[PDB]
Amino acid sequence: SNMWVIGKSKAQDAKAIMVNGPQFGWYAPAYTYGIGLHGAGYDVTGNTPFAYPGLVFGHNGVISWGSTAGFGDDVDIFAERLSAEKPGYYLHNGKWVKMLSREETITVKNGQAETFTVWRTVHGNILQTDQTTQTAYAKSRAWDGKEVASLLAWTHQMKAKNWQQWTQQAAKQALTINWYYADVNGNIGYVHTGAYPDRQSGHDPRLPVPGTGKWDWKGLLPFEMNPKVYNPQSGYIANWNNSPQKDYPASDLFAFLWGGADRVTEIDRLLEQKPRLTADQAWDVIRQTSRQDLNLRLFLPTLQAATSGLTQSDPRRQLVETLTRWDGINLLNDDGKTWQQPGSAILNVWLTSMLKRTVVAAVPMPFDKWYSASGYETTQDGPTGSLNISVGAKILYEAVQGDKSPIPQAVDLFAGKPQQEVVLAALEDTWETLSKRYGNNVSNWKTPAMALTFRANNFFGVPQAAAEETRHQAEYQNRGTENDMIVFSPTTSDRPVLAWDVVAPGQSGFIAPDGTVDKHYEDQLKMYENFGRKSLWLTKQDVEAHKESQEVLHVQR
Amino acid sequence: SSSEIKIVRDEYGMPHIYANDTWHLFYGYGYVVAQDRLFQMEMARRSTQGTVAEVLGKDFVKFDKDIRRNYWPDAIRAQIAALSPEDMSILQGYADGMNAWIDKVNTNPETLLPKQFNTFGFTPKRWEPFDVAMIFVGTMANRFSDSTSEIDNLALLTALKDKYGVSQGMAVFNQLKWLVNPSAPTTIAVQESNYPLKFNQQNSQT
Ligand SMILES: [Ca+2]
């Protein structure tokens, strides 16, 4: 998910501009739901995932808000000490405590029902147990017991009218989420929200801790520790799931890292390129970043260095010269299925070979498979989510940086060989693989483009539409599932706010029993493809002026 | 009027709700959600609570068990029982509004029941506050704020220790899964601030 917020000193023809692209995957019907609320203290417009009571994306005429997943480490695993005799108990602070337990029956259509038991300790639900070691693992969340309060914080914050009121609700949101703020006066802010544990000294948060008592968390850190900034010196706030702040530790996921190679740099370069940006240029960052290869920037200098002393007719060098002429933007050919330049295919093959010779080789099986993906891995339907720089590639980037990387290279990943030799060998592998399938004339290589599928199954793999309701888009775009823009104090209108969004395929997913599709089932689908957007209305006048229908209810509680 | 809820849809079909108190407001919201997205909402309700195999069969039994393993329903119900009457109104207004449209649907299915329901062979059931809360828990807290691989981490660490010996095994673990990396690009510039805490990275708990 990404987000850029542009304040007073960077905005052109407005005081503030917020552009948000939450990345949830692509679905039919649409992952988010558009809704305007007017009354009881509320006056809001926007769209939100699964029609939650609180709107994750929108504004209330004075302030606007948006989110990106935070990825802090707020979950730790407690290794609980069991006993072969006295089962259902666990040692905690010198006594044998009984576990909570509940029985569940799974009813099955056209099958027999299944029943099992769920166990819970003071630390959380038991994930797995090791009867050989008499150890059971409990997953402990810092937000446990605060699920409902987090939902309500996301609702109540829609009433805030400034930073002070908004942060009071951000302090109650307990999930690891980045929250963003903009207002009619051109102020902008950011908070990495959530509840984080106050761990005991010497607790390494990447690995399990004994659950017998001495490693128990001390409590939760205060809100004053949550990374946060208001009206930053830079003029803007940008995030693509990168690190909130210097020295802040990331999730403990082995596949997740915040290193020197990070895709947020792709947004930064574009916002730093121009002294000020208009709304139309802020919106245009969606289209550039959507199409940008993420590895080019990272490994082009290494490729250039290693092929610098090669002759004109060495094929390894001609592969690097093709890359050097490319800006990394992928565009479709006229056929709707191949890319105009072969760059991503070359990087993909090179990177898979480089990882197999370096990172993969230093790690024992079967953990070596965690570091082999190049990050281009997809299928015919296309990527299920965003494109990112793979873990293996982030670790390889540190390695090619030499003593300029802050990470001590305890093992030499190049195993005694000069880097340039390993780079050239991988480049030979790349030439062999690609020339075999396409031939030797690089200029007519037509390599396959990634496409995009709006799936009929939701993110859990469960149907939420029939299989024919699947929609296909020829061009894969590394962008939000929805995109929404809010512009405060436009010099070009009399309105204090202007906002736009796009919710594809459409706002309705209704299909009548006779198969008649709602009028708003798919009227946003081509707009999404073309990087278009529709206006969001807030004031009564604007709602009345654009009304297509009205329904009045009289109800009493 | 206090009993009135006005629903205006725009040219893209986006609903605006006009009401004078909380319960009426979110009743309106739930009612248009039931109009627009009933089947999606019912399948998300089954997904977040692990009741998919009841309408879809044996392929979803492991899925259902995994979902129920990953939360504790009584803890959610206790949080709902401690809300104040104004906060409770959000949740129950929303469920009541859904229910009002579901009642009309199950009464006039020939024209109002979403095709999907006939295709998959089952009909919509009524909602309670607990269901609304579980949509958010299931799709927001569980998808984006429940990540850990600490057990796998340990199995990697153990394997590195066997290959490179105890001290160096650890140093290779820190090369692959570092705790922090000072060169990472950050949303907040260093000039403004940095995180104050420092952590152990030697697995000192063993
Ligand atoms: Ca952890």
PDB file of C-alpha atoms in Angstrom, chain A residues 24 29-40 42 45-46 48 50-53 74-77 102 104-109 114 116 118 120 125 137 139 141 143 145 147-148 151-152 154 156 175-176 190 202-209 215 221 225 228-229 232-233 237-239 242-249 251-254 256-259 362-363 367 370-371 395 398 406-411 458-460 462-464 469 506-507 509-513 520 523 527 534 536-537 540 543 546-557, chain B residues 3-19 21-27 29 31-33 35-37 39-41 43-44 47 52-54 56-58 60-61 63-65 67-73 76 79 83 87 89-90 94 109-116 133 135-156 159-160 163-164 168 170-171 173-188 190-205:
ATOM      1  CA  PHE A  24      -5.332  -5.444  -0.848  1.00  0.00           C
ATOM      2  CA  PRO A  29     -17.159  -7.310  -6.296  1.00  0.00           C
ATOM      3  CA  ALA A  30     -14.886  -4.520  -5.078  1.00  0.00           C
ATOM      4  CA  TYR A  31     -12.900  -4.808  -1.917  1.00  0.00           C
ATOM      5  CA  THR A  32     -13.997  -1.369  -0.700  1.00  0.00           C
ATOM      6  CA  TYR A  33     -17.455   0.233  -0.379  1.00  0.00           C
ATOM      7  CA  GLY A  34     -18.324   3.923  -1.091  1.00  0.00           C
ATOM      8  CA  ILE A  35     -20.530   5.659   1.534  1.00  0.00           C
ATOM      9  CA  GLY A  36     -21.414   9.204   2.719  1.00  0.00           C
ATOM     10  CA  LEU A  37     -22.729   9.798   6.276  1.00  0.00           C
ATOM     11  CA  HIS A  38     -24.542  12.935   7.301  1.00  0.00           C
ATOM     12  CA  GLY A  39     -25.869  13.260  10.836  1.00  0.00           C
ATOM     13  CA  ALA A  40     -25.341  12.642  14.539  1.00  0.00           C
ATOM     14  CA  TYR A  42     -20.851  12.968  11.311  1.00  0.00           C
ATOM     15  CA  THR A  45     -17.521  10.960   2.362  1.00  0.00           C
ATOM     16  CA  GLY A  46     -15.179   8.156   1.161  1.00  0.00           C
ATOM     17  CA  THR A  48     -13.755   1.604   3.149  1.00  0.00           C
ATOM     18  CA  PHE A  50     -15.915  -4.473   3.661  1.00  0.00           C
ATOM     19  CA  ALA A  51     -18.177  -1.488   4.506  1.00  0.00           C
ATOM     20  CA  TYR A  52     -16.728  -1.161   8.056  1.00  0.00           C
ATOM     21  CA  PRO A  53     -18.607   1.334  10.279  1.00  0.00           C
ATOM     22  CA  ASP A  74       3.433  -6.608  17.820  1.00  0.00           C
ATOM     23  CA  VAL A  75       3.158 -10.376  18.088  1.00  0.00           C
ATOM     24  CA  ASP A  76       5.618 -12.640  20.007  1.00  0.00           C
ATOM     25  CA  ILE A  77       5.353 -16.402  20.682  1.00  0.00           C
ATOM     26  CA  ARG A 102     -13.517 -24.513  24.180  1.00  0.00           C
ATOM     27  CA  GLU A 104     -15.933 -26.417  18.289  1.00  0.00           C
ATOM     28  CA  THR A 105     -18.133 -28.344  15.846  1.00  0.00           C
ATOM     29  CA  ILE A 106     -17.678 -27.752  12.160  1.00  0.00           C
ATOM     30  CA  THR A 107     -20.917 -28.590  10.302  1.00  0.00           C
ATOM     31  CA  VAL A 108     -20.166 -29.754   6.738  1.00  0.00           C
ATOM     32  CA  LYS A 109     -22.569 -29.647   3.774  1.00  0.00           C
ATOM     33  CA  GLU A 114     -16.063 -32.432  12.913  1.00  0.00           C
ATOM     34  CA  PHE A 116     -12.001 -30.231  17.898  1.00  0.00           C
ATOM     35  CA  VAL A 118      -9.064 -24.760  21.007  1.00  0.00           C
ATOM     36  CA  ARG A 120      -5.596 -20.736  25.413  1.00  0.00           C
ATOM     37  CA  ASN A 125      -4.252 -19.191  21.790  1.00  0.00           C
ATOM     38  CA  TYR A 137       3.422 -22.290  21.562  1.00  0.00           C
ATOM     39  CA  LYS A 139       0.684 -16.514  20.062  1.00  0.00           C
ATOM     40  CA  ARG A 141      -0.747 -10.139  20.356  1.00  0.00           C
ATOM     41  CA  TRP A 143      -3.760  -5.692  20.643  1.00  0.00           C
ATOM     42  CA  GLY A 145      -8.632  -7.316  24.046  1.00  0.00           C
ATOM     43  CA  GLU A 147     -10.172  -5.248  18.691  1.00  0.00           C
ATOM     44  CA  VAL A 148     -13.486  -3.485  19.272  1.00  0.00           C
ATOM     45  CA  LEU A 151     -12.843  -0.380  15.145  1.00  0.00           C
ATOM     46  CA  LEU A 152     -14.373   2.469  17.197  1.00  0.00           C
ATOM     47  CA  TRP A 154     -11.460   4.358  13.221  1.00  0.00           C
ATOM     48  CA  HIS A 156     -14.721   8.319  15.942  1.00  0.00           C
ATOM     49  CA  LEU A 175      -3.353  -2.566  15.250  1.00  0.00           C
ATOM     50  CA  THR A 176       0.020  -1.984  13.560  1.00  0.00           C
ATOM     51  CA  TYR A 190       1.617  10.834  10.207  1.00  0.00           C
ATOM     52  CA  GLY A 202      17.474  -9.252  26.594  1.00  0.00           C
ATOM     53  CA  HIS A 203      14.292 -10.409  24.843  1.00  0.00           C
ATOM     54  CA  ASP A 204      15.185 -10.811  21.124  1.00  0.00           C
ATOM     55  CA  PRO A 205      11.805 -10.176  19.413  1.00  0.00           C
ATOM     56  CA  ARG A 206      12.560 -12.392  16.377  1.00  0.00           C
ATOM     57  CA  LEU A 207      12.509 -15.652  18.323  1.00  0.00           C
ATOM     58  CA  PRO A 208      10.289 -17.384  20.899  1.00  0.00           C
ATOM     59  CA  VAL A 209      10.539 -16.732  24.663  1.00  0.00           C
ATOM     60  CA  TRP A 215      10.004 -13.220  30.015  1.00  0.00           C
ATOM     61  CA  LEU A 221       4.753   1.157  25.555  1.00  0.00           C
ATOM     62  CA  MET A 225       6.905   6.184  21.793  1.00  0.00           C
ATOM     63  CA  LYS A 228       4.912  10.287  14.467  1.00  0.00           C
ATOM     64  CA  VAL A 229       5.637  13.609  12.723  1.00  0.00           C
ATOM     65  CA  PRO A 232       7.737  17.621   8.425  1.00  0.00           C
ATOM     66  CA  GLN A 233      10.579  19.827   7.228  1.00  0.00           C
ATOM     67  CA  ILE A 237       5.025  12.277   3.798  1.00  0.00           C
ATOM     68  CA  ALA A 238       5.531   9.120   1.701  1.00  0.00           C
ATOM     69  CA  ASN A 239       5.166   5.506   2.523  1.00  0.00           C
ATOM     70  CA  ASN A 242       8.845   1.022   4.452  1.00  0.00           C
ATOM     71  CA  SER A 243      10.218   1.880   7.835  1.00  0.00           C
ATOM     72  CA  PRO A 244       8.498   4.619   9.818  1.00  0.00           C
ATOM     73  CA  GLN A 245      11.695   5.878  11.409  1.00  0.00           C
ATOM     74  CA  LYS A 246      15.403   5.410  12.058  1.00  0.00           C
ATOM     75  CA  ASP A 247      16.038   2.421  14.368  1.00  0.00           C
ATOM     76  CA  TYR A 248      12.460   1.149  14.375  1.00  0.00           C
ATOM     77  CA  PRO A 249      12.361  -2.649  14.210  1.00  0.00           C
ATOM     78  CA  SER A 251       7.857  -7.393  11.918  1.00  0.00           C
ATOM     79  CA  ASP A 252       9.744 -10.605  12.794  1.00  0.00           C
ATOM     80  CA  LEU A 253       8.664 -12.228   9.493  1.00  0.00           C
ATOM     81  CA  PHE A 254      11.699 -13.910   7.882  1.00  0.00           C
ATOM     82  CA  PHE A 256      10.106  -9.065   5.622  1.00  0.00           C
ATOM     83  CA  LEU A 257      12.979  -6.561   5.804  1.00  0.00           C
ATOM     84  CA  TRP A 258      13.555  -2.827   5.864  1.00  0.00           C
ATOM     85  CA  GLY A 259      16.993  -2.420   4.268  1.00  0.00           C
ATOM     86  CA  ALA A 362      24.981 -20.070   2.107  1.00  0.00           C
ATOM     87  CA  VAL A 363      21.737 -21.306   3.663  1.00  0.00           C
ATOM     88  CA  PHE A 367      15.609 -22.839   4.239  1.00  0.00           C
ATOM     89  CA  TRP A 370      13.055 -18.859   1.292  1.00  0.00           C
ATOM     90  CA  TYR A 371      15.706 -16.761  -0.466  1.00  0.00           C
ATOM     91  CA  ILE A 395      20.101  -9.288   1.266  1.00  0.00           C
ATOM     92  CA  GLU A 398      23.684  -5.313   1.115  1.00  0.00           C
ATOM     93  CA  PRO A 406      25.987  -1.317   7.828  1.00  0.00           C
ATOM     94  CA  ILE A 407      25.239  -5.067   8.011  1.00  0.00           C
ATOM     95  CA  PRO A 408      28.242  -7.163   8.952  1.00  0.00           C
ATOM     96  CA  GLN A 409      28.799  -9.807   6.330  1.00  0.00           C
ATOM     97  CA  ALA A 410      29.512 -12.727   8.642  1.00  0.00           C
ATOM     98  CA  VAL A 411      29.631 -15.071   5.626  1.00  0.00           C
ATOM     99  CA  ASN A 458     -11.932 -13.372  -1.740  1.00  0.00           C
ATOM    100  CA  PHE A 459      -8.501 -13.144  -0.135  1.00  0.00           C
ATOM    101  CA  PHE A 460      -9.177 -16.179   2.051  1.00  0.00           C
ATOM    102  CA  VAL A 462     -13.562 -18.343  -0.533  1.00  0.00           C
ATOM    103  CA  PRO A 463     -16.088 -17.551  -3.247  1.00  0.00           C
ATOM    104  CA  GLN A 464     -17.869 -14.229  -2.944  1.00  0.00           C
ATOM    105  CA  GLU A 469     -17.827 -12.806 -12.407  1.00  0.00           C
ATOM    106  CA  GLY A 506     -18.464  -0.718  -9.259  1.00  0.00           C
ATOM    107  CA  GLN A 507     -20.366   0.178  -6.152  1.00  0.00           C
ATOM    108  CA  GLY A 509     -22.406  -6.331  -6.802  1.00  0.00           C
ATOM    109  CA  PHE A 510     -26.141  -7.051  -7.155  1.00  0.00           C
ATOM    110  CA  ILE A 511     -27.429  -9.516  -9.721  1.00  0.00           C
ATOM    111  CA  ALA A 512     -31.221 -10.216  -9.729  1.00  0.00           C
ATOM    112  CA  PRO A 513     -32.548 -13.767  -9.741  1.00  0.00           C
ATOM    113  CA  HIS A 520     -23.710   0.139 -11.152  1.00  0.00           C
ATOM    114  CA  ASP A 523     -19.466   1.212 -14.538  1.00  0.00           C
ATOM    115  CA  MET A 527     -12.106   4.134 -15.500  1.00  0.00           C
ATOM    116  CA  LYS A 534     -14.947  10.087 -10.270  1.00  0.00           C
ATOM    117  CA  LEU A 536     -16.734  12.267  -4.266  1.00  0.00           C
ATOM    118  CA  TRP A 537     -19.485  14.601  -2.986  1.00  0.00           C
ATOM    119  CA  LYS A 540     -25.926  18.682   0.495  1.00  0.00           C
ATOM    120  CA  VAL A 543     -25.346  15.540  -3.348  1.00  0.00           C
ATOM    121  CA  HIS A 546     -25.957  14.747  -8.615  1.00  0.00           C
ATOM    122  CA  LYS A 547     -28.808  12.652  -7.215  1.00  0.00           C
ATOM    123  CA  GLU A 548     -29.951   9.703  -9.283  1.00  0.00           C
ATOM    124  CA  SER A 549     -32.469   8.388  -6.730  1.00  0.00           C
ATOM    125  CA  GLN A 550     -33.905   8.798  -3.257  1.00  0.00           C
ATOM    126  CA  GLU A 551     -35.469   6.486  -0.670  1.00  0.00           C
ATOM    127  CA  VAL A 552     -37.001   7.612   2.628  1.00  0.00           C
ATOM    128  CA  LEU A 553     -37.466   5.305   5.627  1.00  0.00           C
ATOM    129  CA  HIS A 554     -39.437   5.938   8.805  1.00  0.00           C
ATOM    130  CA  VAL A 555     -38.262   3.670  11.640  1.00  0.00           C
ATOM    131  CA  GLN A 556     -38.310   3.648  15.354  1.00  0.00           C
ATOM    132  CA  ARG A 557     -36.059   1.762  17.564  1.00  0.00           C
TER     133      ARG A 557
ATOM    134  CA  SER B   3     -37.589   8.475  12.874  1.00  0.00           C
ATOM    135  CA  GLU B   4     -36.632   9.485   9.357  1.00  0.00           C
ATOM    136  CA  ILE B   5     -33.668   8.149   7.377  1.00  0.00           C
ATOM    137  CA  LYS B   6     -33.171   9.666   3.922  1.00  0.00           C
ATOM    138  CA  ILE B   7     -30.970   7.735   1.432  1.00  0.00           C
ATOM    139  CA  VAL B   8     -29.762   9.624  -1.670  1.00  0.00           C
ATOM    140  CA  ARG B   9     -27.654   7.739  -4.316  1.00  0.00           C
ATOM    141  CA  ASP B  10     -25.396   9.619  -6.719  1.00  0.00           C
ATOM    142  CA  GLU B  11     -24.688   9.029 -10.417  1.00  0.00           C
ATOM    143  CA  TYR B  12     -22.296   6.159  -9.543  1.00  0.00           C
ATOM    144  CA  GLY B  13     -24.811   4.646  -7.157  1.00  0.00           C
ATOM    145  CA  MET B  14     -22.898   5.773  -4.035  1.00  0.00           C
ATOM    146  CA  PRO B  15     -25.291   6.096  -1.048  1.00  0.00           C
ATOM    147  CA  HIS B  16     -25.499   9.126   1.235  1.00  0.00           C
ATOM    148  CA  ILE B  17     -27.241   8.712   4.588  1.00  0.00           C
ATOM    149  CA  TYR B  18     -29.110  11.568   6.300  1.00  0.00           C
ATOM    150  CA  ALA B  19     -30.270  10.823   9.905  1.00  0.00           C
ATOM    151  CA  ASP B  21     -28.991  10.159  15.636  1.00  0.00           C
ATOM    152  CA  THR B  22     -26.479   7.375  15.763  1.00  0.00           C
ATOM    153  CA  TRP B  23     -28.733   4.373  15.626  1.00  0.00           C
ATOM    154  CA  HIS B  24     -30.668   5.738  12.626  1.00  0.00           C
ATOM    155  CA  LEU B  25     -27.491   6.762  10.838  1.00  0.00           C
ATOM    156  CA  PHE B  26     -25.800   3.382  10.934  1.00  0.00           C
ATOM    157  CA  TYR B  27     -29.115   1.640  10.335  1.00  0.00           C
ATOM    158  CA  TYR B  29     -25.574   2.417   6.285  1.00  0.00           C
ATOM    159  CA  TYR B  31     -29.451  -1.130   4.858  1.00  0.00           C
ATOM    160  CA  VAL B  32     -27.626   0.115   1.735  1.00  0.00           C
ATOM    161  CA  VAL B  33     -24.808  -2.391   2.305  1.00  0.00           C
ATOM    162  CA  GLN B  35     -28.829  -3.704  -0.889  1.00  0.00           C
ATOM    163  CA  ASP B  36     -25.469  -3.491  -2.699  1.00  0.00           C
ATOM    164  CA  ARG B  37     -23.281  -6.283  -1.347  1.00  0.00           C
ATOM    165  CA  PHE B  39     -23.686 -12.081  -1.011  1.00  0.00           C
ATOM    166  CA  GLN B  40     -20.150 -10.667  -0.549  1.00  0.00           C
ATOM    167  CA  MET B  41     -21.006  -9.700   3.037  1.00  0.00           C
ATOM    168  CA  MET B  43     -19.440 -14.920   2.479  1.00  0.00           C
ATOM    169  CA  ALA B  44     -17.132 -12.577   4.383  1.00  0.00           C
ATOM    170  CA  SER B  47     -14.989 -16.569   6.207  1.00  0.00           C
ATOM    171  CA  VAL B  52     -17.792 -21.925   5.112  1.00  0.00           C
ATOM    172  CA  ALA B  53     -17.981 -25.715   5.071  1.00  0.00           C
ATOM    173  CA  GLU B  54     -21.674 -25.621   6.124  1.00  0.00           C
ATOM    174  CA  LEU B  56     -19.646 -25.248   0.610  1.00  0.00           C
ATOM    175  CA  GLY B  57     -18.575 -28.638   1.898  1.00  0.00           C
ATOM    176  CA  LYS B  58     -15.566 -30.802   2.688  1.00  0.00           C
ATOM    177  CA  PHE B  60     -13.345 -26.001   3.487  1.00  0.00           C
ATOM    178  CA  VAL B  61     -13.119 -27.972   6.768  1.00  0.00           C
ATOM    179  CA  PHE B  63      -9.964 -23.601   6.499  1.00  0.00           C
ATOM    180  CA  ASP B  64     -12.840 -23.416   9.005  1.00  0.00           C
ATOM    181  CA  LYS B  65     -10.785 -25.077  11.743  1.00  0.00           C
ATOM    182  CA  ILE B  67     -10.076 -19.645  11.411  1.00  0.00           C
ATOM    183  CA  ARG B  68     -11.626 -20.805  14.708  1.00  0.00           C
ATOM    184  CA  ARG B  69      -8.184 -21.684  16.146  1.00  0.00           C
ATOM    185  CA  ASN B  70      -7.021 -18.099  15.603  1.00  0.00           C
ATOM    186  CA  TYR B  71      -9.416 -16.254  17.913  1.00  0.00           C
ATOM    187  CA  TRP B  72     -11.488 -16.411  21.080  1.00  0.00           C
ATOM    188  CA  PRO B  73     -15.149 -15.466  20.596  1.00  0.00           C
ATOM    189  CA  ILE B  76     -14.950 -10.344  21.575  1.00  0.00           C
ATOM    190  CA  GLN B  79     -15.694  -6.221  24.657  1.00  0.00           C
ATOM    191  CA  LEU B  83     -19.577  -0.569  25.349  1.00  0.00           C
ATOM    192  CA  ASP B  87     -20.961   3.133  20.991  1.00  0.00           C
ATOM    193  CA  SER B  89     -25.720   1.963  18.814  1.00  0.00           C
ATOM    194  CA  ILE B  90     -23.193   2.088  15.983  1.00  0.00           C
ATOM    195  CA  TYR B  94     -25.776  -1.301  11.445  1.00  0.00           C
ATOM    196  CA  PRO B 109     -37.048 -13.708  -3.101  1.00  0.00           C
ATOM    197  CA  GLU B 110     -38.413 -13.932  -6.647  1.00  0.00           C
ATOM    198  CA  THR B 111     -37.167 -10.392  -7.373  1.00  0.00           C
ATOM    199  CA  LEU B 112     -34.853  -9.449  -4.512  1.00  0.00           C
ATOM    200  CA  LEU B 113     -32.624 -12.443  -3.684  1.00  0.00           C
ATOM    201  CA  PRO B 114     -29.127 -12.035  -5.196  1.00  0.00           C
ATOM    202  CA  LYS B 115     -28.633 -14.645  -7.911  1.00  0.00           C
ATOM    203  CA  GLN B 116     -25.562 -16.003  -6.104  1.00  0.00           C
ATOM    204  CA  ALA B 133     -17.209  -6.694  14.818  1.00  0.00           C
ATOM    205  CA  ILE B 135     -15.863  -8.616   9.777  1.00  0.00           C
ATOM    206  CA  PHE B 136     -13.282  -6.041  10.974  1.00  0.00           C
ATOM    207  CA  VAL B 137     -11.349  -8.480  13.227  1.00  0.00           C
ATOM    208  CA  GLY B 138     -11.172 -11.109  10.511  1.00  0.00           C
ATOM    209  CA  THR B 139     -10.206  -8.974   7.526  1.00  0.00           C
ATOM    210  CA  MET B 140      -8.260  -6.145   9.181  1.00  0.00           C
ATOM    211  CA  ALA B 141      -6.640  -7.312  12.411  1.00  0.00           C
ATOM    212  CA  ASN B 142      -6.053 -10.860  11.212  1.00  0.00           C
ATOM    213  CA  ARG B 143      -4.833 -10.034   7.708  1.00  0.00           C
ATOM    214  CA  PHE B 144      -2.581  -7.064   8.452  1.00  0.00           C
ATOM    215  CA  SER B 145      -1.690  -7.174  12.156  1.00  0.00           C
ATOM    216  CA  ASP B 146      -1.137 -10.757  13.056  1.00  0.00           C
ATOM    217  CA  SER B 147       2.151 -11.625  11.322  1.00  0.00           C
ATOM    218  CA  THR B 148       4.909 -13.643  13.005  1.00  0.00           C
ATOM    219  CA  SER B 149       7.338 -16.379  11.887  1.00  0.00           C
ATOM    220  CA  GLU B 150       9.128 -16.739  15.227  1.00  0.00           C
ATOM    221  CA  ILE B 151       8.925 -20.541  15.234  1.00  0.00           C
ATOM    222  CA  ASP B 152      10.350 -20.770  11.710  1.00  0.00           C
ATOM    223  CA  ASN B 153      13.000 -18.217  12.632  1.00  0.00           C
ATOM    224  CA  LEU B 154      14.159 -20.539  15.363  1.00  0.00           C
ATOM    225  CA  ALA B 155      14.323 -23.549  13.039  1.00  0.00           C
ATOM    226  CA  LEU B 156      16.489 -21.467  10.651  1.00  0.00           C
ATOM    227  CA  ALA B 159      20.153 -25.019  11.238  1.00  0.00           C
ATOM    228  CA  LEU B 160      22.647 -22.178  10.851  1.00  0.00           C
ATOM    229  CA  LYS B 163      26.330 -25.557   9.830  1.00  0.00           C
ATOM    230  CA  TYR B 164      28.560 -22.734  11.093  1.00  0.00           C
ATOM    231  CA  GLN B 168      28.909 -17.647  13.838  1.00  0.00           C
ATOM    232  CA  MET B 170      24.033 -16.328  15.145  1.00  0.00           C
ATOM    233  CA  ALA B 171      26.062 -13.802  13.193  1.00  0.00           C
ATOM    234  CA  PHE B 173      21.178 -15.161  11.280  1.00  0.00           C
ATOM    235  CA  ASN B 174      21.780 -11.453  11.896  1.00  0.00           C
ATOM    236  CA  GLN B 175      23.023 -11.116   8.328  1.00  0.00           C
ATOM    237  CA  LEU B 176      19.849 -12.646   6.891  1.00  0.00           C
ATOM    238  CA  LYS B 177      17.192 -11.371   9.303  1.00  0.00           C
ATOM    239  CA  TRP B 178      18.743  -8.268  10.864  1.00  0.00           C
ATOM    240  CA  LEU B 179      16.745  -6.592  13.679  1.00  0.00           C
ATOM    241  CA  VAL B 180      17.357  -3.080  12.283  1.00  0.00           C
ATOM    242  CA  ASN B 181      19.355  -1.655   9.351  1.00  0.00           C
ATOM    243  CA  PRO B 182      20.321   1.969   9.719  1.00  0.00           C
ATOM    244  CA  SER B 183      20.387   2.614   5.996  1.00  0.00           C
ATOM    245  CA  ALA B 184      16.640   1.819   5.460  1.00  0.00           C
ATOM    246  CA  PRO B 185      14.718   4.706   3.837  1.00  0.00           C
ATOM    247  CA  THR B 186      12.245   6.012   6.469  1.00  0.00           C
ATOM    248  CA  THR B 187       8.927   7.934   6.276  1.00  0.00           C
ATOM    249  CA  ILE B 188      10.198  10.234   9.053  1.00  0.00           C
ATOM    250  CA  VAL B 190      16.236  11.556  10.987  1.00  0.00           C
ATOM    251  CA  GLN B 191      16.278  15.331  11.567  1.00  0.00           C
ATOM    252  CA  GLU B 192      12.858  15.005  13.128  1.00  0.00           C
ATOM    253  CA  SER B 193      13.446  11.987  15.365  1.00  0.00           C
ATOM    254  CA  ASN B 194      14.526   8.441  15.840  1.00  0.00           C
ATOM    255  CA  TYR B 195      13.187   5.489  17.800  1.00  0.00           C
ATOM    256  CA  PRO B 196      14.538   5.497  21.306  1.00  0.00           C
ATOM    257  CA  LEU B 197      14.530   1.797  22.170  1.00  0.00           C
ATOM    258  CA  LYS B 198      17.378  -0.663  21.651  1.00  0.00           C
ATOM    259  CA  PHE B 199      16.760  -4.408  21.554  1.00  0.00           C
ATOM    260  CA  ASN B 200      18.649  -7.611  22.153  1.00  0.00           C
ATOM    261  CA  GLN B 201      19.835  -9.375  19.024  1.00  0.00           C
ATOM    262  CA  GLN B 202      21.629 -12.396  20.402  1.00  0.00           C
ATOM    263  CA  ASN B 203      18.581 -14.351  21.447  1.00  0.00           C
ATOM    264  CA  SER B 204      19.530 -13.772  25.070  1.00  0.00           C
ATOM    265  CA  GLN B 205      16.376 -15.569  26.365  1.00  0.00           C
TER     266      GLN B 205
END
